[PDB]
């Protein structure tokens, strides 16, 4: 498995095992491009205690990276609430326009 989940900075992010090794107190850069530090006191190093919500940008980015059809990624995207900052970041990660992410994610408003 090239990609694994890892809770850090209050969300379950995904990371590329070819580029990072997870260690307590050490930063890594997740698929969403956020640099995050797992901490033992937050339960980050104990998988049975991962209670944070999933990182929406990492989730969508993982599906895209596993080669999902755009319709399926869209259904997946619809189960998150997308702030404008989340749309912008996903746009940067998918390397597409803001308008295409709005369409993909069903973000209204």
Q: By C-alpha distance, which of 26, 51, 49, 28 is closest to 39? A: 26
Buried b (16+ CB within 10 A) or exposed e, 36-45: bebeeebebb
Member of 45, 55, 62, 86 binding Zn ion (CB under 5 A): 55
SS3 3: strand
Under rule CB under 5 A, residue 73 binds Zn ion:
no
2-41 footprint of Zn ion as x/- string (CB under 5 A)? -----------x----------------x-x---------
How near is the Cβ of 98 to Zn ion at its closest, in Å? 18
How near is the Cβ of 14 to Zn ion at its closest, in Å? 6
Tell how many helices (H) and how many strands (E) occur in the chain.
4, 4
Binding site for Zn ion (CB under 5 A): 13, 30, 32, 55, 58
């Amino acid at each position: 498995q090239r990609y694994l989940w890892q809770q850090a900075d209050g969300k379950r992010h995904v990371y590329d095992t070819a580029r990072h090794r997870v260690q307590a107190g050490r930063p890594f850069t997740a698929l969403c491009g956020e640099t995050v530090t797992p901490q033992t006191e937050r339960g980050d190093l104990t998988a049975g205690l991962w209670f944070d919500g999933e990182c929406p940008v990492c989730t969508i980015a993982l599906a895209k990276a596993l080669g999902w059809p755009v319709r399926e990624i869209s259904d997946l995207a619809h189960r998150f609430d997308w702030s404008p900052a989340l749309i912008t970041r996903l746009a940067e990660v998918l390397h597409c326009s803001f308008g295409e992410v709005v369409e993909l994610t069903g973000a209204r408003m």
